[PDB]
Amino acid sequence: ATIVALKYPGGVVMAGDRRSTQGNMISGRDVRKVYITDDYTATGIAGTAAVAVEFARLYAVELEHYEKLEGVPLTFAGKINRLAIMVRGNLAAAMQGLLALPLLAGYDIHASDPQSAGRIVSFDAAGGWNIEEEGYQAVGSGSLFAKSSMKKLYSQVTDGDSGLRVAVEALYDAADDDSATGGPDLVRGIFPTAVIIDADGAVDVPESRIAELARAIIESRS
Amino acid sequence: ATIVALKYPGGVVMAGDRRSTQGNMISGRDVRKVYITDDYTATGIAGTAAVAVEFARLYAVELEHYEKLEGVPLTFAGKINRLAIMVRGNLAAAMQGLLALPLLAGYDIHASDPQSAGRIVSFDAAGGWNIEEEGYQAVGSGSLFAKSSMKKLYSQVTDGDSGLRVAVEALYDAADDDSATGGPDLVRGIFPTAVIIDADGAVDVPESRIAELARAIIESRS
Amino acid sequence: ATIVALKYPGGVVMAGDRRSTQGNMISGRDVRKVYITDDYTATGIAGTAAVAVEFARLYAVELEHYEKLEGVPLTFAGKINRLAIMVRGNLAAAMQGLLALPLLAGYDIHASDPQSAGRIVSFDAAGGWNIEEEGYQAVGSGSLFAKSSMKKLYSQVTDGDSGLRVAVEALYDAADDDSATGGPDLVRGIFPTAVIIDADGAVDVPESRIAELARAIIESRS
Amino acid sequence: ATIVALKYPGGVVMAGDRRSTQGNMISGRDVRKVYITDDYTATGIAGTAAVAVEFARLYAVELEHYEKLEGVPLTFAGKINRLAIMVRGNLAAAMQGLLALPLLAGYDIHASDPQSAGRIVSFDAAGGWNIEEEGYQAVGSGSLFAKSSMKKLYSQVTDGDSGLRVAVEALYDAADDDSATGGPDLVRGIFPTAVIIDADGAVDVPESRIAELARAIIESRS
Amino acid sequence: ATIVALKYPGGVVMAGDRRSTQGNMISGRDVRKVYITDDYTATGIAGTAAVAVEFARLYAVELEHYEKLEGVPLTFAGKINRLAIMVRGNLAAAMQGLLALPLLAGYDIHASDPQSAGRIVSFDAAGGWNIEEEGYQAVGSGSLFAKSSMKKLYSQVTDGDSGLRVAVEALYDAADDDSATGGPDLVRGIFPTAVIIDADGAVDVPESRIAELARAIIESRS
Amino acid sequence: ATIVALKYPGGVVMAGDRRSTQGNMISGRDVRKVYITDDYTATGIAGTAAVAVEFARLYAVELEHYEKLEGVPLTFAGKINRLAIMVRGNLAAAMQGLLALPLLAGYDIHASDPQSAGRIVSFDAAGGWNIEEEGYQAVGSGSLFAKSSMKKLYSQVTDGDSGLRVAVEALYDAADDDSATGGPDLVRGIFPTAVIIDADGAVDVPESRIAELARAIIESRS
Amino acid sequence: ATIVALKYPGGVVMAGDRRSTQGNMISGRDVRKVYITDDYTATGIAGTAAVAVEFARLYAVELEHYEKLEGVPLTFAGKINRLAIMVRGNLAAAMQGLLALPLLAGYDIHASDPQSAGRIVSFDAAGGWNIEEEGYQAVGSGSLFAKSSMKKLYSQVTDGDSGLRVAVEALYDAADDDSATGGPDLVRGIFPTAVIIDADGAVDVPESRIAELARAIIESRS
Amino acid sequence: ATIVALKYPGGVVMAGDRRSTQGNMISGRDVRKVYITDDYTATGIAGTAAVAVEFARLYAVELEHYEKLEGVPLTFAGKINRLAIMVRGNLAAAMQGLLALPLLAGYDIHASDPQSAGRIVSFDAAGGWNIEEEGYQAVGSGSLFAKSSMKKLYSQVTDGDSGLRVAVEALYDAADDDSATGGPDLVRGIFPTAVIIDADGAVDVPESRIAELARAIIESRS
Amino acid sequence: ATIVALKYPGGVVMAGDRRSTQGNMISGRDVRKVYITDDYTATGIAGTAAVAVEFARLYAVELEHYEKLEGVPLTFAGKINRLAIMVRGNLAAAMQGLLALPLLAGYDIHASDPQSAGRIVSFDAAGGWNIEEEGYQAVGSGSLFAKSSMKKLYSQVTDGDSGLRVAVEALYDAADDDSATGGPDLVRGIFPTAVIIDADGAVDVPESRIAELARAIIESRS
């Protein structure tokens, strides 16, 4: 399982693969791991479908509950703090074999420069968080291969389409190197899922755009 | 890793996949695991390239050494006994984490009915061996999926081409269900390797025949 | 023990075997493991008779209690959530040697397309749940053999009778491969139990229909 | 796995089942566990095919080697002593997880009363042996059920046919109670193997006689 | 510590870093890990200076001893076999905390096509060996980062200079990602060591060529 | 990770490096570990960014809460006592693998001699604290190398600029000897962060002053 | 215990302290740890008097035995190899709690440039050896403090007297920082022992020269 | 660390050394371990500065709190009882590696004979206390050497100056024999701290008196 | 048990106590632990009577055997080497609970200055030996008290009588402080045993001289 996130001028993009495994046995082929949590943020957890959907459900409930009580949404720092509290309150269970490390992507609407308002936040096992400054991040078992691919491909990113293409290619490289990550499935027609957040909000990327991009990458590598 | 073997009227066929893994990391894409050991037998070990090639090398040396000393080749039972001795003399090392379970396919030229002269022999960890009577066998981490596929497809086998096709389809099903087994790679052009043994001896199957069969299976499943 | 479930156009079918074991000793020959829990759902737990009947009893009590308090039945998602809470609240006892993994089959009456309203939900040890998209699922110790049989036989399913026949044949294959699963007993006259859920609700399949289907399968394999 | 032996007036009969298991998974359906070792003795080991065939092979080689060196066959007591030495020289490996407990049946030609010349000898883990005096014995995982069945059915034994029938019925009861023992397979046509030793020597029982006896037992129990 | 090797048209190149560590403490800044072992082969071990120099010394003594006894040098396969024997005879000590995994680069003069005569051989802990077919390989603690860098940069290799440049850049990326690997030291003037093997034999690359290449890479990344 | 602090006539200076590691893998290149906690104190924790920022956040909240409740700020001894209570209340978690040892620097405005009003306080694992009397202190994994460098360079400190230069040189020596400490990065332009506290309060040192000082040190050592 | 060695133009100098400890208890005040082993080499082991004297005795016997058998002394590389064999043949006893790590200093008379003929060789626990290139080295429990002191003081070394002074000052700093190392004892009149090796051979430094140098250092630090 | 106490005619004297250690590494050179707790008592704990200062702070707070509540100071027996309660309430933490054993010195103003009113009380790990009758006591890691020195020197004590001199000489002997105890530092000018309690109360001994006494002892031993 | 040895002008003296213990139970009151081993040496082992007498017996046999074979006695260094070999060849048994640490006293007749020809050699557990330079040494469980007493009393030694008196007083102090050492027994009349070695050889001290010295010490301490 691998989720990637990268920043482009005017927004941020996040994408993940679709495989779930029980040892060496493939247990799922259509897992969704990236969820929109509010109008300007999205979360991705590298794990089973249930853990991702449940963590995203609880985080979205907390954010909307605050918005309804107080009349205004939380600031980006407040959202990071609430997520960090939820992650920290699970360390004993994580060391008991149930560890969920999330990745957060968002757009800050109160920033002075809108072209650099995209944000990426990662978390560690102890519950610590870091705002990333290089422009990309990856979590999961193929995260090192994906990060090494983005390190070489990031110079080509100039807007949303280039960023989406680079994210799909990084996921393809992670699948090429690690067997717990699933590649594009042309026989069944299953492709990675992506979310784009910009000044207008977080939207889901349609499946045909991802399919055309993945097919072009495959013909390029042939 | 998976090796399959099945019997058809007039001979036997054996085929294996090409993947080697170190945990969840893909370490090889072109591993050969099926080797011709003499004029009428072939062996397949589910493991790394070095173990398969070294075990096959030692077994072939033993068989040719006997043939040169005595002037005649061993009988099929003598070959089984020598292989069983070699397998038995490795049990402590196998329980130490280095276990190699071979699969043997051969053609008995001293049988009275030439159409049923194909043989398949499997081995267990303790060193025990069994001559198979159902018509097919599989070893490795995807052996259960391959055996369940051959159980349903074996009624279509009537000659060498049908047997080769059923063997390739069983390997495809094993790859579809288990991530340590590699499927046909159309981008790189890597396909499983096969050997056919009949009354004229053991020959390697050319790569283009396997490639056409695998492509037909893929278009059928699409 | 094995329970299978598959989707056909217009409904869903679920069936299980009748054997209970204490090690290698047969302890029961007439165990019922599939229970109707409300008018449109059925549950199956792979285990002893008492665990299946008690879990089904508690789940049915919870569903009817909500229906009586609120005046309306829960939605399908609410039923999944309540079942997931019950499964999650048993993880320590499951790791203490008492693990019960249920399988849920249902018909959603609020779906827009009635021909695809059948649902199948599976659970994992940690309490996670997945809605299945391939059309079939199996749990228990013979679940892999049954799933490999349904993978090859699912193209023949066009309505309720074909689905029932394919489910019985998958259970027969699981019994043929795994000794903890019991096959059809012709001497004693004991056959697997099945439930069919469609737009009119969940009904038990009569024993003579299952008996005729099993006898036809046995004569086909002879 | 179960082997039974019983004494009738004028000889002895020994029979075993055909199943081999790896945990709960059926690994063999045609295992032969009873072998003729010389002209008047037969041995049965409850285990895999390889262990039974190899132990019988070594014991037969030892007996024939003595007969060729000395010009005369060993006495029955000498055969028991040699078998006991072979069994004793395996205790550490047996406690290491590889335990083979044999059962010996024979006809003593130097006895004064030919109608009571049949012998049955059993062995324990430590290597101790006992000549049986009740008329029947069983080894394996279903040995208790088979012995309890022979205790009630032994009054019907008056000659070779009755003894064969009672042995087949005892094996059927063992299969009915224990899942590691295989019953008669009517779909595949596989039946237990038997050996009869009398004043003329040890002969294999043809498969059709066993098949007719098993079918009569099955119709009786229906 | 990291050693890289890659194949170019007409030869092969191998290079390694200069750092040795004792935990988090830097213990050496001028370690040489790549040694010429005969006229057409070179070896690299990822470890301390003493282990690399001693293993290379023993392997070179063995190769020259054979050449002096027999009058001819060994074939490439014979050299691989001797190295594999030496590696295999150290497994217990390797699991005792002293593991040395070598990487072999060579030029085969008896190949029919001189432009593809370069060879790269890697070894695993158990002693197994593989001839590489992709064109590059890396060992050590930064081997994954170096391999991911060569995967993207290998399309630029057309001759010896390009291959040397790509090898230096891959070592730079490994140092950038892993702290046990040392980067180019401009204050002290210490650079990686390289060896080039072609049809004329194995030669050491002068330090000023490596220094100019590393300086150009550093100004490119600035 | 290393933080250094030293006293000069009229104030105190504190500086730390920017590296975070996960074993031998570099995980961060821009970590800030020194934070201004009130108008006259600064704290530095050798660890991840999250631990440093969170500990500093809690300590600053406590100090400002007291100042708002009571109308006056705490004395220097009261601040030391509150910090010691916070450090002591974490010993079990520290022995559980999460140990945070802070270093405190401050300026006492109620001292009679303003030229010696700078203070440095260190803490141990058990929670004990010491006011330092030699003029410098260091914490972290390169603290011994930095302390040995300051022991030789402290005679050159006469004012704020000399103290800043000596602190940067001590951090450079720590990075030169220990691989978990990061040196000045000229390719990326990342330099250590420093804080100066004097009679006017604690201010952050601009990045260009540190950059010029580090460049002069590098050219001196070349 | 600490031994230091440094290279000056025209030779090498080695010196060690005089303390032996049993835990926190001082057990010796006059231990000699540096011994002349032949006309151009000296060895120092950080440990008890008996271990140092016995190791030096055995090494000197080996060197003189070779010189008497062969008629010529060994080369410097041969001496290093013999010492490395002796060190390697003690690893199990070293891990059993008796570890002796030697330091070797010598003058190579067959070098082309006599002003750089001094050599310093260190050894690790596994038996590996390194020729040092920086100009100084230290072993023992205060070796890090001594090395950090020599790093700052080495620019003052221009001949034998300066090198001796820097070695004494480095030992003084090691004693100042670590309690297992003894400083100059002015009450008892005990000072460190030193050896100087140049083109004329290895000689012991008289005690009054060391005493005057140590007294000057003490008055400088006062 | 060592604290000594001895009784002279008309009062009592207590003194301790200034060293703190972390294993074999010197961590402090100016530790104060003897504190005045009320007008007629003083306490000394052999340990770090923080433990001594914190224990003394808590004990002084308790004594003054009683004096303020009740209007009169506690008797000497009441002070011993309160100290014993505090020591006893720390046994589990002491066996967890944090053991603090105090030594108490005081002057009893309600005794009938003022020349023998000095008191010395020691404590054990279990919390037990003893009033000493020999005239001297010592705690710490050099307590045995100090006690053996006082046993021979106690005949010279006739008043406050002789007692102070004997206490300083006993501390010097403890430092001479044990490396965790620090001796007089003439280079840095650091000397042991002492307290004298007589009929007028407890006062701190000035540093120059201790310095002159220590210098006279050093010249005597030279 | 305690043995003391001290050097006086013209010779050496050695003395030990007479107690043996089994835990807290007194098991012997007349143990002799100091034995003359040749004309100029004596040995003392702190332990049971049998160990001391047997070790002394073996060492004396070895010394006399050499003297008889070679015609001359060994040098003092040769005697030390032989004793060290015997002590070293017992380390495993010593760590098994049977540890014997000897103390050697002797007179060197080949020394140039006869007034300083006395020698004292001690041994450690690992087998290491040291020639002592301070003038006295002690081994056993009361060795620290005896050494601290000799440190204060050694200034009074001017000849054999003073040395004997100081040795008896040191043994008395050891008995006064440690309960495993026995003091002079006036009721039974048992006193310590002593040996004096001078230029004329080693002689046993008569019991009445020791008795008068011990009585004078006792009346002095009263």
Author numbering:
A (entry chain O), B (entry chain P), C (entry chain W), D (entry chain V), E (entry chain Q), F (entry chain b), ...: 1 to 222
Wording from the paper:
The Mycobacterium tuberculosis (Mtb) proteasome system selectively degrades damaged or misfolded proteins and is crucial for the pathogen’s survival within the host. Mtb 20S core particle features homoheptameric rings in a conserved α7-β7-β7-α7 configuration. These rings assemble to form three interconnected compartments: two antechambers formed by α7-β7 and a central degradation chamber. Stacked β-rings enclose the degradation chamber where active sites containing the catalytic triad of βT1, βD17, and βK33 proteolyze substrates.
Notably, 20SβT1A has a slightly higher RMSD value of 0.63 Å compared to the 20SOG variant (RMSD 0.22 Å) and the ixazomib-bound 20SWT variant (RMSD 0.35 Å), highlighting subtle structural differences between them. A comparison of Cα RMSD values calculated separately for the α- and β-subunits showed that conformational changes in the β-subunit primarily account for the observed RMSD deviation in the 20SβT1A variant. While the overall arrangement of the catalytic residues within the 20S CP is essentially unchanged, we noticed small but clear differences in the structure of the 20SβT1A variant. This results in the displacement of switch helix I by 4.7 Å, which in turn shifts an upstream β-strand and short loop containing residues βA46, βG47, βT48, and βA49, which form the back of the S1 pocket. The altered position of switch helix I is stabilized through the formation of a new hydrogen bond between the backbone carbonyl of βG47 and Nε of βK33. The helix formed by residues βF76-Q96, hereafter referred to as switch helix II, is unchanged in this structure.
